[PDB]
């Protein structure tokens, strides 16, 4: 019942340079400042359509029908008015509160908040330094600017309104999402739409959809995401030779349950070994660090951030190391405790059972009013059932916009 | 506690032409007669190696070792002596009694006994006639034979002892297993071996009653003509240089196993399979309504119509017109496809079991279930208590002799 977001935010609240500010994303060259809200330590929400993180995706034009995929939805006017942005902000906040009301969501969000990208940006071996792509540029009242570290940004979707994804900026030398370091994560997401599926009789709770992307973000903030070149190719058609479906190992892991079982035990051992090896490397770097630059935080306090992040051990002499048992639990939580299917019962929802059950339609929803959707029950306000997710019974809460069939 | 098999059978019991006789399968061209036991109405057991249903698999020769797959087991001497065939016979009967001791198995076996293959074999549209794939020839004193209908035959395995499967004749040219008609089913099976597996990630052994129930579920689907087309398959592949082998599993197998595997079948496929089965019952209803004669039997036409009215849970109105009731079909189809799964038997049998096909068996073990000190009708291997220590191949090591690992 403790909320994740400890104060009320309205889109029209005046900027203050602290938790309501105009910001710019350093890797986005051509952007004008956008109003953003720091809803929790390290977590910002930008209630705008994402035209700025990627130069190529800088417009909201729907492609020609022949280039569209069936599972997509376009509306260039969505999220253009202040009333819409206020509703978007409140809906995203409500979902974080819903996630945080479960034991598992509390653990997921604590990992995310603790998951400071590693300070591995110095060329000098004994010196800790931030990596500049894990910051935003904050505009302050008075015309002054500052750089500020953060872990997670939620933005509105790009052109395709239902293409939810978790992305981050790259490094010239490191694969930050896979070398244990982590990097600031940017999630495209909308609380104003959800998908329908059949046992489109039932609507997905948008809290599950956000939790899914937050699991990708946690994997990527802890630098243990599976290489996107590890992929499973699926066919259910005896006739199409080439045509089929492709799903990454990272997606099989993140979804969980029986889908993860498509990943061989030998791959799991390898990923575990690799993540353990990368923690050992980070410990060596922390042990060899003697100076720190770009902050007034003392060196030991900065080391402690990562001792806590990676559940590292420290002995009497200050030597940092990886405890095998602590790593085992750390890795289990991140890869097996945090899955989409593990959230189904804590949320008390009905949900898709596998990636092979494709969404059938997209619906408009409005979760901000408590008579429609609550923190503790989502759509299922009336009782301990999934009638609230039934798009026929509870039809007033789900307006069908497009079928994918 | 009532058994499925209401009398005792010994392999050496003298033939009697009724429930112990030498038989020939008409669709198996070159087979010599084999001793068979009618353990229940419509159900026969042939306690010998299957060298006769398929002439090409008429030998027990182990293929060249270089040609063998890891998941296989060969022993040309298994089931060669009368003592072995007797032990096989009694073990299969014991598993039927174990299945029959559960409410769900009793329902499954009731569907199997009632599931007479449809009499749709006539060249004339208005005439009911048997289809020849659904009979055996029973040898009588004097060497002459008579034709007798049946639903199910259990035989010993062919060359590969652990290749358990449910098969039927005319599968190449007929669609009897998918058009609602059904056909007599032949199961290769052994109660003398079972598989070991590890709890989800060969410490635990599968209860052979679960394995037989699995094959009987295939048989029920095929006796009711609702089997999913075997070209409906789930195929997964990775890069060709990856050690981990791609996989192939039919939709029919995903359905039969149950649980989370069935969820890999998209709802749109499920709706189609249901619609197809409903349409095929409408065809059967139309054929029964238009039937005016019956041939090859003194059973009156109306009695045979009633047999299939009951089989398919068809409705009759005041005028005698047969039709499919939507609610009756929905329940009919649910029972056959959702009620009868391998995983639905796990708790009735009180066993530990694999949860998915993606958890592959690790080994094959020799077992001996006939002695009650090893395995009972009501408890299987788990004699000790309400646990699965009886299935632990380490604790209960005396009941599981490891023969081959598949890794
Ligand atoms: Zn995903
Ligand atoms: Zn099967």
What is the C-alpha separation between B68 and B47, in angstroms, rounded?
A: 26
Q: How many CA atoms does the CB half-sphere of B296 hold within 13 Å?
A: 16
In this structure, what DSSP letter does residue A120 have?
B
Q: CB A9: neighbour CB atoms within 10 A?
A: 19
Q: How many CA atoms lie within 13 A of A364 on its CB side?
A: 7
For A238, which of B233, B236, B244 is closest by C-beta distance?
B233
| Residues 6+ away with beta carbon under 8 Å from A66 | none
Collapsing DSSP states into helix, strand and coil, what is residue A87?
Answer: helix
Cα–Cα distance between A205 and A373 in angstroms, integer?
Answer: 10
Chain breaks in chain B (C to N over 2.5 A) after: 201
Cα separation, B346 vs B104, whole angstroms: 11
Q: How far apart are the first and last CA of chain B?
A: 40
Pairing of strands B363-366, A202-203: unpaired
Pair of tokens at residue B262: 């069935």
Residue count (chain B): 407
The helix, strand and coil proportions of chain B, stated in percent and rounded to the nearest 5, come to 30, 20, 50
C-alpha–C-alpha distance, residues A47 and A190, integer Å: 9
CB contact under 8 A, A257 and B261: no
Cβ atoms of residues B206 and B375 within 8 Å = no
B244 touches A at CB < 8 Å:
yes
Q: List, in sequence order, the alpha helices (H) in B204-250.
A: 208-223
Q: Does A171 touch chain B (CB under 8 A)?
A: no
Q: Are B5 and B90 in contact (CB under 8 A)?
A: no
Q: How many CB atoms lie within 10 A of CB B1?
A: 7
Q: Which of A140, A6, A192, A161 is nearest to A68 (CA)?
A: A161
Give one DSSP letter per residue of B222-282, joined into a string. HHTT-PPPTT-EEEEE--TT-SSPPEEEEHHHHHHH-HHHHTTS-HHHHHHHHHHHHHHHH
Sheet holding A245-248, edge to edge: A245-248, A231-235, B233-237, B247-250
The distance in angstroms from the start CA to the end CA of chain A is 39
A261/B233 touch (CB, cutoff 8 Å), yes or no = no
A144: helix, strand or coil: coil
Whether residue A232 and residue B244 make contact (CB cut-off 8 A), yes or no, is: no
CB A234 within 8 A of CB B234: yes
Kindly state the tokens that stand for A395: 């039809």
DSSP state of A121: -
Smallest CA-to-CA distance from A202 within A387, A341, A70, A400 is with A387
As a whole number of angstroms, the distance between CA A137 and CA A17 comes to 11
CB A398 within 8 A of CB A364: yes
Distance of CA B74 to the CA centre of its chain: 22
Report how far residue B370's alpha carbon sits from residue B372's, in angstroms, rounded to the nearest whole number: 6
Number of Cβ atoms within 10 Å of the Cβ of B187: 20
Tell me the longest C-alpha to C-alpha distance in chain B. Answer: 67
Number of domains in chain B: 1
CA–CA distance, B380 with B350 (Å, rounded to integer): 9
Task: For residue A100, give the 3-state DSSP assignment.
Answer: helix
Tokens representing B407 are 């890794």
Q: How far apart are CA B271 and CA B397, in angstroms?
A: 46
Which uninterrupted H or E stretch holds A308? helix A299-309
Is the CB of B266 less than 8 angstroms away from the CB of A231? no
Q: With an 8 Å Cβ cutoff, is B289 touching chain A? A: no
**Nearest CA-CA partner of B344 in B254, B255, B258:** B258
Measured distance CA(B399)–CA(B390) in Å, rounded: 9
The pair of structure tokens assigned to A398 is: 């789900």
CA atoms in the 13 A half-sphere facing the CB of A274: 17
* CA A190/CA B104 separation, integer angstroms: 47
Q: Are A122 and A66 contacting, i.e. CB atoms less than 8 angstroms apart?
A: no
Which residues, 6+ apart, have CB-to-CB distance to B283 below 8 Å? B179, B180
A232 touches chain B (CB under 8 A): yes
- Enter the tokens of residue B351: 């066993």
CA-to-CA distance for B339 and B103, rounded, in angstroms?
11
CB of A403 less than 8 A from some CB of B: no
- Beta strands at B363-366 and B315-316: parallel, antiparallel or unpaired: unpaired
Whose structure tokens read 């509105």?
Answer: A156
3-class SS at A104?
helix
B6 Cβ contact partners less than 8 Å away, ≥ 6 residues apart: B40
d(Cα A236, Cα A244) in Å, to the nearest integer? 8
Q: What contacts B394, CB < 8 A, 6 or more positions away?
A: B203
Q: Give the CA radius of gyration of chain B.
A: 22
Helix, strand or coil, per DSSP, at residue B316: strand
Q: For residue A8, give the 3-state DSSP assignment.
A: coil
Cα–Cα distance, B62 to B404 (Å, whole number)? 15
CB spacing of B267 vs A357 below 8 angstroms: yes
The Cβ-side half-sphere exposure at A197, using a 13 Å CA radius, reads 18
DSSP per-residue string spanning B19-38: SEEEEE-TTSTTPPPEEEEE
Question: What are B69's two structure tokens?
Answer: 């797959």
Q: Whole-angstrom Cα distance, residue B223 to residue B166?
A: 11
A333-337 LR contacts (CB < 8 Å, sep 24+):
A333/A107, A333/A111, A334/A111, A334/A218, A334/A219, A334/A222, A334/A224, A335/A219, A335/A224, A335/A253, A335/A271, A336/A256, A337/A104, A337/A107
Beta-bridged to residue B166, according to DSSP, are B187
Q: What are phi and psi of A193, to 5 degrees?
A: -140, 150
User: Mind telling me how many Å the CA of A261 is from chain B's nearest CA?
Assistant: 6
Separation of alpha carbons B193 and B369, rounded Å: 10
* Residue A389 φ then ψ, to 5°: -90, -5
Name A194's bridge partners. A363
Distance CA B41, CA B123 (A): 29
Residue A356 sits at the chain B interface (C-beta within 8 Å): yes
CB pair distance less than 8 Å for B263 and A353: yes
Q: What are phi and psi of B72, to 5 degrees?
A: -165, 160
DSSP secondary-structure letter at B65?
A: G
Q: Specify the resolution in Å.
A: 2.0
Task: Provide the token pair at A236.
Answer: 């259910």
- Tell me how crowded residue B241 is: count the other CB atoms within 10 A of its CB: 5
Contact criterion met (CB below 8 Å) for A177 and A216: no
- Indicate the SS3 state at residue B198: coil
Ligand 1 centroid vs A212 CA: distance in angstroms? 6
- In three-state secondary structure terms, A335 is helix
A chain contacts of residue B264, beta-carbon cutoff 8 Å: 258, 354, 356
Distance in angstroms (rounded) separating the CA atoms of residues A204 and A162: 13
Backbone phi and psi for residue B216, each to the nearest 5 degrees, phi listed first: -65, -30
Distance, CA of A35 to CA of A24 (rounded, Å): 9
Residue A197: phi and psi, rounded to 5, are -145, 160
Q: How many C-beta neighbours within 10 Å does residue A288 have?
A: 11
User: Range of A46's domain?
Assistant: 1-405
- A14 token code pair: 């005046």
Mutate to test the interface with A, among B199, B200, B240, B267 (most CBs of A within 10 A): B267
If we measure between CA atoms, which residue out of A315, A289, A313, A310 comes closest to residue A300? A289
Q: What are phi and psi of A172, to 5 degrees?
A: -70, -35
Minimal C-alpha gap between B218 and chain A (Å): 21
The helix/strand count (H/E) of chain B reads as 9, 18
At A49, list the tokens.
């359509």
Q: How far is A70 from chain B (nearest CA, A)?
A: 16
Does B358 sit within 8 Å of A261, measured CB to CB? Answer: yes
d(CA B299, CA A40): 81
Q: CA B371, CA B19: separation in Å to the nearest integer?
A: 25
Q: After which residues is chain A broken (C to N over 2.5 A)?
A: 199
* Those residues with Cβ within 8 angstroms of residue B334's Cβ, 6 or more apart along the chain or in another chain: none
Task: Specify the residue for token string 């020799």.
Answer: B366
Give burial (CB, 10 Å; 0-12/13-18/19+) of A392.
Answer: exposed
Instruction: Locate A217 and state its tokens.
Output: 């973000």
Closest CA to B340 of B262, B241, B400, B232: B262
Read off the tokens for A37: 């809200």
Q: How far is B55 from chain A (nearest CA, A)?
A: 29
B1-6: Cβ within 8 A, 24+ apart: B1/B101, B1/B377, B1/B378, B2/B100, B3/B96, B3/B97, B3/B100, B3/B377, B4/B39, B4/B40, B4/B93, B4/B96, B4/B97, B4/B99, B4/B100, B4/B109, B5/B39, B5/B40, B5/B93, B5/B96, B5/B97, B6/B40
Would you tell me how many other CB atoms lie within 10 Å of the CB of residue A215? 27
Asked if A21 and A7 count as a contact pair (C-beta separation under 8 A), the reply is no
Q: Helix crossing, A265-288 with A299-309: angle to 10°?
A: 170
Assess B313–A contact: CB distance below 8 Å, yes or no: no
Suggest the residue from A226, A231, A240, A261 to mutate for an interface test with chain B (most B CBs closer than 10 A): A261
Contact A23, A16 (CB under 8 A): no
Q: How far apart are CA A229 and CA A173, in angstroms?
A: 18
- Burial of residue B314 (CB within 10 Å: 0-12, 13-18, 19+) is buried
Beta strands in A13-169 (DSSP E): 20-24, 34-40, 43-49, 127-128, 135-139, 145-149, 152-156, 165-167
Q: Give yes or no for a contact between A141 and A17, defined as CB atoms under 8 angstroms apart.
A: yes
B40 annotated to bind ligand: no
How many whole angstroms separate alpha carbon A350 and alpha carbon A348? 7
Q: Which two structure tokens, joined as six digits, stand for B103?
A: 């409410």
Residue A381: other Cβ atoms inside 10 A = 15
Separation of alpha carbons A289 and A298, rounded Å: 12
How many CA within 13 A on the CB side of residue A131?
A: 24
Task: For residue A100, give the nearest of A330, A329, A346 by alpha carbon.
Answer: A346
- Residue A247's φ and ψ, nearest 5 degrees, are -140, 125
User: Cα–Cα distance between A319 and A390 in angstroms, integer?
Assistant: 56
Q: What is the CA radius of gyration of chain A?
A: 22
Q: Which residues contact B1 (CB under 8 A, 6 or more apart)?
A: B101, B377, B378
Q: Which long-range contacts (C-beta less than 8 Å, at least 24 apart) are formed by B235-240?
A: B235/A234, B235/A235, B235/A236, B236/A232, B236/A233, B236/A234, B236/A235, B236/A262, B237/A232, B237/A233, B237/A235, B238/A230, B238/A231, B238/A232, B238/A233
Helix (H) / strand (E) element for B39: namely strand B34-40
DSSP string, A219-264: HHHTT-PPPTT-EEEEE--SS-SS--EEEEHHHHHHH-HHHHTTS-
Q: What CA–CA distances, in Å, run from B281 to A313, B108, B182?
A: 69, 20, 12
Pairing of strands A43-49, A127-128: unpaired
d(CA B275, CA B261): 21
Angstrom distance (rounded) from CA B191 to CA B88: 7
Q: Is B98 helix (H, G, I), strand (E, B) or coil?
A: helix
Measure the CA–CA gap between A185 and A168, rounded to whole angstroms: 5
Task: Please check whether residue A65 touches B, CB under 8 A.
Answer: no
């Amino acid at each position: 019942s403790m909320p994740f977001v400890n104060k009320q935010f309205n889109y029209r609240d005046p900027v203050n340079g602290v938790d309501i500010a105009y910001i710019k994303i350093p890797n986005a060259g051509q952007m004008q400042p956008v109003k953003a809200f720091k809803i929790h330590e390290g977590v910002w929400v930008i209630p705008e359509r994402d035209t700025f993180t990627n130069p190529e995706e800088g417009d909201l034009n729907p492609p020609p029908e022949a280039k569209q995929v069936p599972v997509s939805y376009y509306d260039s006017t969505y999220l253009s008015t202040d009333n819409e942005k206020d509703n978007y902000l409140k809906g995203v906040i409500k979902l974080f509160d819903r996630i945080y009301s479960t034991g598992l969501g509390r653990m997921l969000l604590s990992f995310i908040v603790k998951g400071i990208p590693f300070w591995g940006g110095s060329t000098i071996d004994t010196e800790l330094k931030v990596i500049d792509t894990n910051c935003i540029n904050v505009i302050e009242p008075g015309g002054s600017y500052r750089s500020e570290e953060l872990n997670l940004v939620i933005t509105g979707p790009s052109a395709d309104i239902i293409q939810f994804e978790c992305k981050s900026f790259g490094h010239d030398v490191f694969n930050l999402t896979r070398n244990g370091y982590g990097s600031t994560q940017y999630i495209r997401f909308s609380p104003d739409f959800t998908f329908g599926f059949e046992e489109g009789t039932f609507a997905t709770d948008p809290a599950v959809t956000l939790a899914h992307q937050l699991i990708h973000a946690a994997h990527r903030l802890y630098g243990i995401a599976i290489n996107p070149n590890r992929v499973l190719k699926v066919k259910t058609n005896a006739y199409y030779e080439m045509s089929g479906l492709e799903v990454s190992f990272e997606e099989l892991r993140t979804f969980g349950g029986n889908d993860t079982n498509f990943i061989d035990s030998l791959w799991q051992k390898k990923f575990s070994r690799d993540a353990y090896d990368n923690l050992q490397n980070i410990a060596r770097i922390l042990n060899e660090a003697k100076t720190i630059v770009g902050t007034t935080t003392p060196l030991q306090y900065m080391k402690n951030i990562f001792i806590r992040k990676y559940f590292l051990s420290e002995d009497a002499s200050g030597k940092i190391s990886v405890n095998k048992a602590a790593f085992k639990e750390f890795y289990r939580v991140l890869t097996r405790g945090f899955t989409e299917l593990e959230f189904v019962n804590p949320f008390k929802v009905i949900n898709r059972k596998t990636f092979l059950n494709f969404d059938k339609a997209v619906f408009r929803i409005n979760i901000v009013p408590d008579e429609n959707y609550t923190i503790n029950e989502g759509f299922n306000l009336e009782g301990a059932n999934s009638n609230g997710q039934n798009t026929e019974i509870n039809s007033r809460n789900f307006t069908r916009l497009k079928n994918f069939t």
